């Protein structure tokens, strides 16, 4: 209530957000990279994506679900 111990408390009310904030960015970037990363720019993935395009779509569906969980846990720190 009195002075500084809030400024060192407001640091900690906010510090518990930095891990869920990073998780949200990392989950969002990994979702965005699903359709642009060099990891999929190989002959193996092009052929794999030709015979079975469902595999890459399944990987995207999993990453979307992980992004949604991460976005929630970050919102629960507000």
């Amino acid at each position: 209530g009195h002075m500084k111990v809030q400024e060192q408390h407001r640091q900690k009310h906010f510090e518990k957000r930095r891990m869920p904030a990073a998780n949200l960015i990392q989950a969002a970037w990994r979702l965005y990279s699903t359709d642009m990363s060099r990891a999929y720019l190989t002959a193996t993935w092009y052929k794999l994506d030709d015979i079975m395009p469902a595999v890459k779509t399944v990987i995207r569906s999993i990453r979307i679900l992980k992004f949604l969980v991460a976005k929630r846990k970050f919102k629960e720190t507000l």
Binding site: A21, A28, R72, F74
Partner: protein, 145 residues
């Protein structure tokens, strides 16, 4: 706004999970497909992922919920605002920027840490001028199409 065929693409992906063909994706089927790809999610992680799209409450994902999720991705208004709020957590100036080094430092040291090649692909996807500051907002505009 979805073509009849890109709906059939999502139906093909849905059917990979829904092996028994009963129209629902349980934690069993979701985790089985995840672990055939080499991932190891906990049972609680499977429930949290399913609960994000389970609009009925029976603990399963049906096809209408599935294609809605697949069509939305991160393009919704709530995602754009929350992802940026996560970037602002590491923004001391309040400028809308963050130094390319601190972004690299945050991505490789907090949460599900990115590999050296992952964060290098992220920094390459953003553009940097002058001091070394990324405009992380036009970055979340790029991620959220």
């Amino acid at each position: 706004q979805l073509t009849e065929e890109q709906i059939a693409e999502f139906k093909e992906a849905f059917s990979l999970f829904d092996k028994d063909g009963d129209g629902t994706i349980t934690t069993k089927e979701l985790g089985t497909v995840m672990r055939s790809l080499g991932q190891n999610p906990t049972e609680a992680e499977l429930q949290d992922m399913i609960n994000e799209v389970d609009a009925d409450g029976n603990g399963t994902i049906d096809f209408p919920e599935f294609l809605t999720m697949m069509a939305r991705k991160m393009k919704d208004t709530d995602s754009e605002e929350e992802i940026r709020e996560a970037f602002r957590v590491f923004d001391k100036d309040g400028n809308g920027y963050i130094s390319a080094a601190e972004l690299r430092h945050v991505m490789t040291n907090l949460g599900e840490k990115l590999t050296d090649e992952e964060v290098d692909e992220m920094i390459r996807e953003a553009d940097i001028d002058g001091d070394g500051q990324v405009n992380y907002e036009e970055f979340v505009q790029m991620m959220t199409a």
